[PDB]
Amino acid sequence: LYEVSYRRYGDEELHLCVSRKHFALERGCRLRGLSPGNYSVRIRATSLAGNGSWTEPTYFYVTDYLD
């Protein structure tokens, strides 16, 4: 599996578990219907041995369709 830890600046952390089947199907992850803003993502692969280091933060901006 993988864990996706996203957070829109100021808010609290949101999460998502992406399983193998889920990952191979979706070609990664897909985040559906987030309120607008600049989000910060870290990703962490969990293998048979343990939880391996979080990917440095990436930023993604969901459009405001107003402002």
Ligand SMILES: *[C@@H]1O[C@H](CO[C@@H]2O[C@@H](C)[C@@H](O)[C@@H](O)[C@@H]2O)[C@@H](O)[C@H](O)[C@H]1NC(C)=O
């Ligand atoms: C999204 O946010 C990135 C990181 O923001 C940085 O840290 C915060 C706490 C503020 O100090 C901010 O001014 C810093 O830039 C930005 O570097 C990035 O450009 C932003 N992304 C978009 C799409 O606007």
